[PDB]
Amino acid sequence: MELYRDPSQPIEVRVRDLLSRMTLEEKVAQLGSVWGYELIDERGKFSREKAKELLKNGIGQITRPGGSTNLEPQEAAELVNEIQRFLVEETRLGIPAMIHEECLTGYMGLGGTNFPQAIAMASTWDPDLIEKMTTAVREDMRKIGAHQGLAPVLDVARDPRWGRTEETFGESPYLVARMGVSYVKGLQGEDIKKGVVATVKHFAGYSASEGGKNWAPTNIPEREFKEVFLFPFEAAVKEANVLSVMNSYSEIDGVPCAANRKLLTDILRKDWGFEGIVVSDYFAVKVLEDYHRIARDKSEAARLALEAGIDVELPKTECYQYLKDLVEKGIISEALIDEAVTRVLRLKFMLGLFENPYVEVEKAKIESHRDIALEIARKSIILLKNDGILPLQKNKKVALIGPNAGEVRNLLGDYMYLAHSIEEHMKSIPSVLDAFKEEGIEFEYAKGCEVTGEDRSGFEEAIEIAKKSDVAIVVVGDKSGLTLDCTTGESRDMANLKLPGVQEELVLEVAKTGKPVVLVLITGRPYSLKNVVDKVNAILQVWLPGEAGGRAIVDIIYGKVNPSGKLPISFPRSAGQIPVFHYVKPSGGRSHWHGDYVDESTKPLFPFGHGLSYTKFEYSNLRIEPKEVPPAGEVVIKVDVENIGDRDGDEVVQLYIGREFASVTRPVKELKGFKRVSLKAKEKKTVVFRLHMDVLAYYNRDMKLVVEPGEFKVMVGSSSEDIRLTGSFSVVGEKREVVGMRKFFTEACEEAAA
Amino acid sequence: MELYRDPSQPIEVRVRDLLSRMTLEEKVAQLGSVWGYELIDERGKFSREKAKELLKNGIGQITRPGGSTNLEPQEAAELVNEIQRFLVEETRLGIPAMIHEECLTGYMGLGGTNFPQAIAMASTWDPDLIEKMTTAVREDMRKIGAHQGLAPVLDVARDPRWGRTEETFGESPYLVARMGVSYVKGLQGEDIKKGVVATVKHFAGYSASEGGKNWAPTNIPEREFKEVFLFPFEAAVKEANVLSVMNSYSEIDGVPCAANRKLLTDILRKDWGFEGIVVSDYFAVKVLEDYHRIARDKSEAARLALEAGIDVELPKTECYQYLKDLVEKGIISEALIDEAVTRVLRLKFMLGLFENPYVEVEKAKIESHRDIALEIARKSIILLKNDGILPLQKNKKVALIGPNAGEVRNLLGDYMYLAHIRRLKKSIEEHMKSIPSVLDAFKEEGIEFEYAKGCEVTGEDRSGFEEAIEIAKKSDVAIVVVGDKSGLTLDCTTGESRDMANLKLPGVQEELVLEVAKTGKPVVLVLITGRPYSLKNVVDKVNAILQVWLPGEAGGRAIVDIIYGKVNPSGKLPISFPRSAGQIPVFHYVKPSGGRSHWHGDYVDESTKPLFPFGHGLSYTKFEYSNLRIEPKEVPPAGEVVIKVDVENIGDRDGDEVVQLYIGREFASVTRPVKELKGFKRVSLKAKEKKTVVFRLHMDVLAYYNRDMKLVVEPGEFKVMVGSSSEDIRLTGSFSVVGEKREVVGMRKFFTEACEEAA
């Protein structure tokens, strides 16, 4: 028994033994991939004939054996078992494949639950719930033989033009990092042999493209890059031990991320100690030639990507096959191949693949997680505005109007399988209309208009039913996806941030009837609401929700659920205001010296952290101890919060920290902690934040990470603008350079109030 | 005779001698300033009583003795002579002051010509004409005893929301640098004793604020910062020997420019060898405390600014007085003071101020340069669109409509004296009366027209629309003149502090254009503006469009000359015109991944292309390009290529064409612009005349920063594109650089040499 086959030997010994036995061809095959669909016949069964060509020298990964084949879970598991058997039994060394799938919003294939989008996950401000979600995704994926999920997205989004906004956790490095670490922890085990490799993406800066345009340059200076864009990735690497990273398609200031050794190696591996695999975004290696025009041919693209630190070329081997020729012609050293192969093999051994690469098909049926999806949807919906009309009385006659009220497709996000037997599977998802029926509401429905186009012919019918109702509920927003008819999603960037089509005019026409209007936004991004805000009575933001969307919206409208979502991204008044974010410097978020633009406020229409409730929360009794702390000390901040209203509800208590008179300019306020707290009517609790000085560190003039003596402002409240209590503490002592491992997060919890 | 007083000694000897004799208080006074208005009585005469307090220890600079006092030229000269006499005769060491004024668009004071705005200057693509202009400004300034002008602005503008767009030379580092060097050369001349110190500003990045908002952070990464923002300053420092630099009010990535030694010293003085003075933007030192919140008090602000490399605090001593206490308390070393004082004294000696600090008041009358202003205005106006209606026949009845057709005030830019400054109220009104209106230009041309204001520049009032529609209905053609009021106050729509988020024409001007168009009459739209506006809703509804960047006193005549074809328009856009705000930024020199959304190309709701591209401008004639030659076809990495094209005026009218050279590069070690402006030549062509345009392009001009941040020329192919705009490319070809990668070290060429030969 060769050492590499022996499970009693340490992983490093198995790796070295395997590597020593491999040919150059075999090594290079471990750095590539093949699509699931390329390995099946027309009946969706594994094809040995195709495998003999594509897998004869082994393979790094199979791309989306469920997601790209439209197979049901048991049939996907059977395909995966057969691929694995061919590798284990019909190749010289018997190295098994790693399988990856998309899974941002749940496993992206037939049979998987469609959870609400990432931006909705962030809107819950509930990291534990997100960990529970990915723990369930982990089980789904392992059932079908998948080992790696391409999620989560840790890009920090402050540009709502960008069509991938919906896939992020919003604008706050702190919130994005906190949600990201929980997301990763749920997917990955403690022991990865029993979990799923998480893939943080897109490293790094991809959400800050020129003009919000997909793949356009992301030109970010160093301090901002470290504190805003890299921070969530750093936390995922160091605190959550994430095992995969995927690169950004964009260039930073002249260098494409896929060709950048300073980013993918010097920061990620050298500075941070990342030990897992870097996988390319799909075709990211090839487009070094085709799009960026910095590689003359496929073999130069391969060289740049391998040197940069990309281990596996996805979704199919294209350039990496030429790594063989580059070694044979003495252009690159085989040692650099060996380094990448080591990282791939290490992970395959840790996943348990050499001991057992198969799954039990009989157990491969994926269970529904509608319960988890519905809890996220209920906690994610945000009440942006309410003059008092909500919650509605069940006896009011409703005119239900708009394209998103009637079309189940438009509840789905860009990486939800049914968006991208299709029609048949779609039929299974509850509509908004269905939720109104089951609630027993008396209503009529008029579509009003389409999501896109200029056709106003449906307006008359919508106006007519509004005139005969007590209240109009107007449901507008996006179709999310990858094609030209979609208004949001990857590749669907929106310059002007107006609701698509004539939906805004539809809202205004309905409002002109003088009936009360509840505006329901089912969207992937913030839209400019400047022209409608004062014309409607209430506004609900529903980030593209699960299969669970309809029920949650209706539950909230009628007050069976008290809304508790808070914005994880600022809502701009208009596109020309971009960007707006809560953590501006003293000179940011304003024009000097008149404050405002000529034609526009510099304040967002709704700020970060905003979200209303059907009850009222009263904050009191701020304590901050001790008042003076040394530069690696800890401060304990306590506030009492009481539900003083008549309905039970959750409040998201938010901690902002401000600093002046540092050696560099600092945010007037930035989010540094938060806690979702449940409060029954008249219940009072204490929220405790334990804030280590490590969490407040920032980069100084010399690019060192420091804590400087001085005063920090503490602001606790219900949004970044609705601050309820303020105080301060001092750091006392000599400037400290923060070296090596440090804390990233405030620890937040609840105690009984006095 | 002390050495410092002796003109036979070298300046370095005089400086060292003077420095050795000064007290700490005297040294610190040379690093400060005093407003002109603080030194006068009620009648605008020099006040000894005030001087005894403010000037007793001498002073670095007097801020705007003309611009801040509302004095006429001769009276300003007299004030300056008295200030100088007090310093020379009544202070211990007799050190004279340096006087500065604003002068972007000409000396900013009573009596000075108001030249068209910087963005209009750039639109001429005529560097020689701008040099002629500043040579005239030089004479004006020296006549009143001013030694330094706070200009030019070398900020590269790609964000039209920003209210100071009008003060820039546009989006192109190359064009900005080329105009900047000519500007500086004209103001300074060869011997500064006979010239005026130019002040390049605002160093650096100030035009790229977050959201286009004045003073907001300018977060620019290193390669882009070097190739885009620093490049024009580098050329001004090294090729034009500029003698002053002013800092930016903004922070770059956490560090305010006024507190940034790596910028104001390490780049500017160490890397580039700048030897002149750094002056603060006004109050830039104090607001390190008040605005950026990185200095705890005025003495800490002073320390940060002096350490960064600011030599003179403007516009008045406020923080720099505490440098005395900082030395006495042993917080900073007097040697650091001496270093800044040396720079100031050196320049005072070079300006000849120790030999003769006075001017002849009898000769201080400033002459009008209307002739030069009118030549700039005629070359700067851009024909954006013309279906054939222009030029008009003089026999057509004209409906002249719009707020900018009737209001002389709205022709003026933010740093033109009669706008900037707004007893004084009465004087401004009087002086305003002198400037020809657009209405006046139509009268003097003898056109038959009626005028209706139509609407105001700001507000929602549509009362005037009926009158305007009615005169349009009874006319042959409607000429609708809309746009900005430029200035510093809330009623202004553009200018410093007046940033515009959504790029819609101010007020209801857009609706006025659309209402006029609905009459079915032919419409000529005239934009008198400081920035690109979104024309997406009007472009297809009007027959012709003229962009008139705020033209100052010559605007009326130039507009009418162009409308009637007495002048053939020849201006070209120096900045892209976006379709809408949400498209920002759009610029011609995007990387292969820039200026598009992958993979559908466009936004969902909008093209990714600008409405009008960089370099765009139409003519009343047609130009035909032929016979591109590129020699040699292979060049070593410090070699030189010669590019020739023939251009023939094939139409019926004489006209100037601006021939533009774009260079593209792929397969470098970093991504490069698909095309970028690297040369240009305004060429005059009579009808049926043909000439050859020659570009001599040294490889130095093409250098860029590689992965390791070294300036290089790499072997490979460069694409040559010659045309009439950045989109209207007429001829393309290429050449190769052959040999080993070259690191471009030390001095290098910045500019293509362009000229004409006989075809």
Contacts of residue B252 in chain A, CB cutoff 8 Å? Answer: 221
Contacts of residue A159 in chain B, CB cutoff 8 Å? Answer: none
Q: Which residues, in sequence order, are CB contacts of B342 under 8 Å at separation 6+?
A: B15, B19
Contact indicator for A535, A408 with CB cutoff of 8 Å? no
Contact indicator for A436, A444 with CB cutoff of 8 Å? no
Cα distance between residue A421 and residue A134, in whole Å: 27
Cα distance between residue A395 and residue A405, in whole Å: 20
Q: Specify which residues A246 forms β-bridges with.
A: A279
Top residue of B161, B202, B213, B596 to mutate, by most chain A CBs within 10 Å, is: B213
Q: Which residues, in sequence order, are CB contacts of B642 under 8 Å at separation 6+?
A: B629, B630, B631, B694, B695, B696, B697
Candidate from A221, A495, A598 with C-beta closest to B603: A495
Place of tokens 């410090």: B638
Q: What is the phi/psi pair of residue A340, to 5°?
A: -70, -45
And the tokens for B549? 């960047």
Contact B596 A252 (CB under 8 A): no
Top residue of A165, A249, A665, A700 to mutate, by most chain B CBs within 10 Å, is: A665
Cα distance between residue A445 and residue A405, in whole Å: 8
Contact indicator for A521, A527 with CB cutoff of 8 Å? yes
* Burial profile A503-537: b = 16 or more Cβ within 10 angstroms, e = fewer: bbbbbebbbebebbbbbbbbbbbbbbbbebbeebb
Candidate from B291, B296, B597 with C-beta closest to A213: B597
B70 Ramachandran zone, left/alpha/beta (phi>0; psi -120 to 50): left
Cα distance between residue B628 and residue B644, in whole Å: 6
Q: Which residues, in sequence order, are CB contacts of A123 under 8 Å at separation 6+?
A: A170, A379, A380, A381, A382, A541, A543, A565, A566, A567, A568, A611
What does R_g of chain B's alpha carbons equal in angstroms? 26
Contact indicator for B251, B205 with CB cutoff of 8 Å? no
In this structure, the dihedral spanned by the alpha carbons of residues B344, B347, B353 and B354, taken in order and rounded to 10 degrees, is 70
Cα distance between residue A526 and residue A523, in whole Å: 7
Cα distance between residue B712 and residue B472, in whole Å: 60
* Burial profile B68-101: b = 16 or more Cβ within 10 angstroms, e = fewer: bbbbbbbbbbbbbbbbbebbbeebebebbbbbbb
- Name the pairing type of β-strands A255-256 and B640-649: unpaired
Cα distance between residue A728 and residue A691, in whole Å: 13
Candidate from A292, A598, A665 with C-beta closest to B493: A598
Cα distance between residue A708 and residue A663, in whole Å: 8
Contact indicator for B397, B89 with CB cutoff of 8 Å? no
Which is nearest to A228 in space by CA: A276, A271, A168? A168
- Name the pairing type of β-strands B690-698 and B753-758: antiparallel
Query: DSSP letters along B526-590, please?
Result: EEEESS----TTTGGG-SEEEEEE--GGGHHHHHHHHHTTSS------SS-B-SSGGG----TT-
* Burial profile B116-147: b = 16 or more Cβ within 10 angstroms, e = fewer: bbbbbbbbbbbbebbbbbbbbbbbbbbbbbbb
Cα distance between residue A436 and residue A553, in whole Å: 9
Cα distance between residue B710 and residue A95, in whole Å: 45
Nearest-neighbour CA in chain B from A73: distance (Å): 31
Contact A255 B500 (CB under 8 A): no
Contact B595 A250 (CB under 8 A): no
Cα distance between residue B489 and residue B420, in whole Å: 9
- Name the pairing type of β-strands A747-752 and A684-692: antiparallel
Chain B residue with minimum CA distance to A499? B605
And the tokens for A742? 């440090």
Cα distance between residue B734 and residue B698, in whole Å: 15
Contact B253 A498 (CB under 8 A): no
Contact A598 B211 (CB under 8 A): no
And the tokens for A258? 């896929």
Cα distance between residue A475 and residue A653, in whole Å: 30
Which is nearest to B85 in space by CA: B55, B61, B109, B41? B55
Candidate from B502, B593, B600 with C-beta closest to A251: B593
Question: Given 3-state DSSP classes, what are the helix, strand and coil percentages for chain A, each rounded to the nearest 5?
Answer: 30, 20, 45
Chain B residue with minimum CA distance to A480? B604
Top residue of B156, B225, B253, B596 to mutate, by most chain A CBs within 10 Å, is: B253
Segments of B218-352 assigned E as strands: 244-247, 251-252, 255-256, 277-279
* Burial profile B207-222: b = 16 or more Cβ within 10 angstroms, e = fewer: bbbbbbbbbbbbbbbe
Deposited resolution, Å: 1.9
Cα distance between residue B559 and residue B543, in whole Å: 17
Cα distance between residue A754 and residue B15, in whole Å: 74
Q: Specify which residues B718 forms β-bridges with.
A: B665, B735
Which is nearest to A210 in space by CA: B712, B419, B596? B596
Cα distance between residue B71 and residue B144, in whole Å: 11
Nearest-neighbour CA in chain A from B489: distance (Å): 8
Q: What is the phi/psi pair of residue A670, to 5°?
A: -145, 145
Contact A592 B213 (CB under 8 A): yes
3-state secondary structure of A231: helix
Contacts of residue A224 in chain B, CB cutoff 8 Å? Answer: 219, 253-254
Contact A493 B671 (CB under 8 A): no
And the tokens for B670? 């970093």
Cα distance between residue B442 and residue B558, in whole Å: 11
Which is nearest to A686 in space by CA: A635, A728, A745, A642? A642
Contact indicator for B538, B491 with CB cutoff of 8 Å? no
Within a 10 A sphere around the Cβ of A363, how many other Cβ atoms? Answer: 10
Please name the method used to determine this structure. Answer: X-ray
Size of interface A-B (CB pairs under 8 A): 237
What does R_g of chain A's alpha carbons equal in angstroms? 26
Nearest-neighbour CA in chain A from B165: distance (Å): 14
Which is nearest to A40 in space by CA: A83, A77, A89, A74? A83
Amino acid identity of residue B744, one-letter, is V
Contact B606 A495 (CB under 8 A): yes
Query: DSSP letters along A170-184, please?
Result: -S-HHHHHHHHHHHH
Cα distance between residue B168 and residue B574, in whole Å: 10
Place of tokens 């693949």: A353
Which is nearest to A107 in space by CA: A417, A412, A544? A417
Which is nearest to A517 in space by CA: A449, A452, A466? A466
Cα distance between residue A291 and residue A141, in whole Å: 34
Within a 10 A sphere around the Cβ of A734, how many other Cβ atoms? Answer: 8
Q: State the Cα angle at B699 between B695 and B703, rounded to 5°.
A: 120
Place of tokens 């010239």: B195
Which is nearest to A729 in space by CA: A638, A664, A608? A638
Element (H, E) at B679: strand B676-685
Contact indicator for B289, B300 with CB cutoff of 8 Å? yes
Helices B334-350 and B11-20, interaxial angle, to 10°?
Answer: 140
Contact indicator for A478, A410 with CB cutoff of 8 Å? yes
Cα distance between residue A184 and residue A197, in whole Å: 8
Contact B294 A215 (CB under 8 A): no
Contacts of residue B291 in chain A, CB cutoff 8 Å? Answer: 586-587, 592
In SS3 terms, A556-620 reads as: HHCCCCCCCCCCCCCECCCHHHCCCCCCCCCCCCCECCCECCCCCCCCCCECCCCCCCCCCEEEE
Question: Could you tell me how many helices (H) and strands (E) chain B has, helices first?
Answer: 22, 27
Contact indicator for A324, A25 with CB cutoff of 8 Å? yes
Contact A579 B493 (CB under 8 A): no
Helices B231-238 and B173-188, interaxial angle, to 10°?
Answer: 30
Which is nearest to A217 in space by CA: B188, B158, B556, B512? B158
Q: Which domains are delineated in chain B? A: 3-363 (3.20.20.300), 371-583 (3.40.50.1700), 623-758 (2.60.40.10)
Cα distance between residue B563 and residue B566, in whole Å: 8
Cα distance between residue B383 and residue B377, in whole Å: 13
CA distances to B404, B444, B469, B475, B480 from B450, in Å = 15, 14, 12, 9, 12
Which is nearest to A373 in space by CA: A572, A134, A173? A134
Chain B residue with minimum CA distance to A301? B667
Cα distance between residue B727 and residue B678, in whole Å: 15
And the tokens for A85? 């058997």
Give the number of C-alpha atoms closer than 13 A to the C-alpha of residue A403, restricted to the C-beta side: 22
Contact indicator for B419, B413 with CB cutoff of 8 Å? yes
Which is nearest to A386 in space by CA: A556, A543, A548? A556
Longest dimension (CA), chain A: 82
Candidate from B295, B497, B586 with C-beta closest to A592: B497
Top residue of A213, A528, A573, A670 to mutate, by most chain B CBs within 10 Å, is: A213
How far from the centroid of its chain's Cα atoms is residue B268's Cα? 20
Query: DSSP letters along B456-510, please?
Result: -SSS---TTHHHHHHHHHTSSEEEEEEE--BSSSTT-SBSTT---SS-PPSTTHH
Contact indicator for A603, A705 with CB cutoff of 8 Å? no
And the tokens for B741? 């990668």
- Name the pairing type of β-strands A617-625 and A634-643: antiparallel
B254 Ramachandran zone, left/alpha/beta (phi>0; psi -120 to 50): left
Contact indicator for B129, B379 with CB cutoff of 8 Å? yes
Contacts of residue B497 in chain A, CB cutoff 8 Å? Answer: 591-594
Chain B residue with minimum CA distance to A289? B667
Cα distance between residue A27 and residue A43, in whole Å: 32
- Name the pairing type of β-strands B544-549 and B523-529: parallel
And the tokens for A209? 């493209």
Nearest-neighbour CA in chain B from A138: distance (Å): 32
- Name the pairing type of β-strands B729-737 and B716-723: antiparallel
Contacts of residue B599 in chain A, CB cutoff 8 Å? Answer: 214, 491
Q: Exposed, middle or buried, A356 (CB in 10 Å: 0-12/13-18/19+)?
A: exposed
Contact indicator for B384, B547 with CB cutoff of 8 Å? yes
How far from the centroid of its chain's Cα atoms is residue A564's Cα? 20
Contact indicator for B674, B664 with CB cutoff of 8 Å? yes
Q: Which residues, in sequence order, are CB contacts of A393 under 8 Å at separation 6+?
A: none
Cα distance between residue B403 and residue B452, in whole Å: 9
Q: Which residues, in sequence order, are CB contacts of A705 under 8 Å at separation 6+?
A: A697, A698, A699, A737, A738, A739, A742
Candidate from A598, A664, A701 with C-beta closest to B499: A598
Q: Which residues, in sequence order, are CB contacts of B356 under 8 Å at separation 6+?
A: none
Contact indicator for A156, A232 with CB cutoff of 8 Å? yes
Cα distance between residue B247 and residue B260, in whole Å: 10
3-state secondary structure of B222: helix
Contact B220 A221 (CB under 8 A): yes
A20 Ramachandran zone, left/alpha/beta (phi>0; psi -120 to 50): alpha
Contact indicator for B75, B65 with CB cutoff of 8 Å? no
Candidate from A215, A484, A579 with C-beta closest to B598: A215
Element (H, E) at B695: strand B690-698
Contact B255 A664 (CB under 8 A): yes
Q: Specify which residues A650 forms β-bridges with.
A: A678
